[PDB]
């Protein structure tokens, strides 16, 4: 059958929500009440790739939009971007490497490591309303842990 997907939202471990910052970036911020309608809803697809109990390959597309988080080198650096794709062909089981994230469950938290760039992870800043980016470690000052919420 087609690739399976789930609608969901993500928050960082500081409980910051994710929203759009222009058409090709996301930002993270403290949201509650009416304002959370601003949050982005993702369609998380369970795709092809190396898997284990706690390590699941996924794609993160924006629900009902032909936009996917992807990891590419930009100015010689692994970087996270929102890339447009052909809506007739996505999502699919066999997503290209750049689109794939290893969803890792550790201590009640989730990490999204780039399948393409080992040990690079979806990250947020502690500061409010800063971009979501690709970070070169699960260590450090930045935030690399998230929780997932299921959406109808």
CATH of the domain at 116: 2.80.10.50
Domain housing 27? 1-152
Instruction: Extract the tokens encoding 151.
Output: 């959406």
In angstroms, the CA 128 to CA 74 distance is 24
- Report the chain's terminal Cα–Cα distance, integer Å: 21
In angstroms, the CA 68 to CA 104 distance is 19
Task: Name the structure determination technique.
Answer: X-ray
User: Resolution of the deposited coordinates, in angstroms?
Assistant: 1.5
- The domain tally of the chain equals 1
Residues 6+ apart with CB under 8 A from 137: 119, 121, 144
Which burial class, exposed, middle or buried, applies to 72 when counting CB atoms under 10 A from its CB (0-12, 13-18, 19+)?
A: middle
């Amino acid at each position: 059958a087609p690739v399976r997907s789930l609608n969901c939202t993500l928050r960082d471990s500081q409980q910051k929500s994710l929203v759009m910052s222009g058409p090709y970036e996301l930002k993270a911020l403290h949201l509650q009440g009416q304002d959370m309608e601003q949050q982005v809803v993702f369609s998380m697809s369970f795709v092809q790739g190396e898997e284990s109990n706690d390590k699941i390959p996924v794609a993160l597309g924006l629900k009902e939009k032909n936009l996917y988080l992807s990891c590419v080198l930009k100015d010689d650096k692994p970087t996270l971007q929102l890339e447009s794709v052909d809506p007739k062909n996505y999502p699919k089981k066999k997503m290209e490497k750049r689109f794939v994230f290893n969803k890792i469950e550790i201590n009640n938290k989730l990490e999204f490591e780039s399948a393409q760039f080992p040990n690079w992870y979806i990250s947020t800043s502690q500061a409010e309303n800063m971009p979501v980016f690709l970070g070169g470690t699960k260590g450090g000052q930045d935030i690399t842990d998230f929780t997932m919420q299921f959406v109808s």
